[PDB]
Amino acid sequence: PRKKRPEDFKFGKILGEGSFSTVVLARELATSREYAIKILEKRHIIKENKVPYVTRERDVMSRLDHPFFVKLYFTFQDDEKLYFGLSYAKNGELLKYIRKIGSFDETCTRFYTAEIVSALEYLHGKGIIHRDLKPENILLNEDMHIQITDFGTAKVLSPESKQARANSFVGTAQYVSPELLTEKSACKSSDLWALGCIIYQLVAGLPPFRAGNEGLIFAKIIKLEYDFPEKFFPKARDLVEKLLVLDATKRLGCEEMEGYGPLKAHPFFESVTWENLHQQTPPKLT
Ligand SMILES: Nc1ncnc2c1ncn2[C@@H]1O[C@H](COP(=O)(O)OP(=O)(O)OP(=O)(O)O)[C@@H](O)[C@H]1O
Ligand SMILES: [Cl-]
Numbered sequence: 001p002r003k004k005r006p007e008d009f010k011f012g013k014i015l016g017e018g019s020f021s022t023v024v025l026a027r028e029l030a031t032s033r034e035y036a037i038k039i040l041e042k043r044h045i046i047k048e049n050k051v052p053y054v055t056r057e058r059d060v061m062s063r064l065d066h067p068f069f070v071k072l073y074f075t076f077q078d079d080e081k082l083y084f085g086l087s088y089a090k091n092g093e094l095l096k097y098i099r100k101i102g103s104f105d106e107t108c109t110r111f112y113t114a115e116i117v118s119a120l121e122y123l124h125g126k127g128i129i130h131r132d133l134k135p136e137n138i139l140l141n142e143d144m145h146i147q148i149t150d151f152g153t154a155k156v157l158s159p160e161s162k163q164a165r166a167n168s169f170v171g172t173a174q175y176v177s178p179e180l181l182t183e184k185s186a187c188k189s190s191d192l193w194a195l196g197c198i199i200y201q202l203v204a205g206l207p208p209f210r211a212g213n214e215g216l217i218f219a220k221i222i223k224l225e226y227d228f229p230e231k232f233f234p235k236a237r238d239l240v241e242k243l244l245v246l247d248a249t250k251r252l253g254c255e256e257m258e259g260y261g262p263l264k265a266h267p268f269f270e271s272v273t274w275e276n277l278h279q280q281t282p283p284k285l286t
Helices: 042-047 051-063 094-101 106-125 178-183 188-204 214-223 234-243 260-264 274-279
Strands: 009-017 022-028 034-041 072-077 081-086 138-140 146-148
Touching: 009 034, 034 042, 042 051, 042 081, 051 072, 051 081, 094 138, 106 146, 106 188, 106 234, 106 260, 106 274, 178 188, 178 214, 188 234
Parallel strands: none
Antiparallel strands: 009 022, 022 034, 034 081, 072 081, 138 146
16 A cells, blocks of 8 residues: 555544654545554664664554554654554453453463463464563453554564573563573573463462562562462462473473463363353453
8 A cells, every 4th residue: 555654644532652752543535544553753763773673563563464463554654754554452461361360360361361371372483482471562452352452572583593591681570581591591481480470470470480670580480489368269270380391391281381272271271262262252351
């Protein structure tokens, strides 16, 4: 289609602001479609060494075509700004719901966990590591299905070299894997560690490794220092214990453990119908 330009849109409210970006709700005049447009100031990206992250976000998102990810529909630029035209995730961040309700019941934990698993199976099947998976980066569409975002710190592993490890230090302290901290690289299984943290957080209300200082969190991660609250769905506890494993080759779902089939077969997921999840009505969050 014709390359889009800023004047092809009418902007509405600011949906959010990052360190180097503003996301605005926009309507495209010629179609009346709604988009979330992420806008970055070139001068700021250039001054602050962010060009590789912006180009990575574009490159990674352009590869994805799955219902559980924010879609990148188009990109354009003008003299001052870069623009990404994204699907609008009307219901915002998963984290908002954890905070408000405190935790999720078993049905809701299972459903949202299954969507995240399905998303990770797709991403890992394309040889992509997210590296910053966390509830703030799991958005929710109007129908309350997940829309994973934040790909500027993802990594496409090279198929040509059969690359498995990625060397950049990126992530969020509560969710960062022990291998990145101790070996200085991440792998696809690093996202499975984050998944374990997220499942724990949905059930318990807080992620498992937490402190007021990042270094204190790192020290607990590397020692596997965490505990479960007395009441925690038992099959979910078992699943978390199979994900929060220091040795990245021993996490359920990883390539060395024979991939996503065994993970989808975990007893916590016994009632899940994997094949049409994105067309199922999500359970109401109460
Ligand atoms: N597609 C979208 N639909 C709805 N809201 C969105 C969408 N994408 C991002 N947001 C919201 O806009 C803000 C996120 O912005 P963005 O990706 O620009 O930066 P960030 O990742 O939050 O920040 P930082 O770069 O500082 O880590 C957040 O509140 C986020 O939830
Ligand atoms: Cl950036």
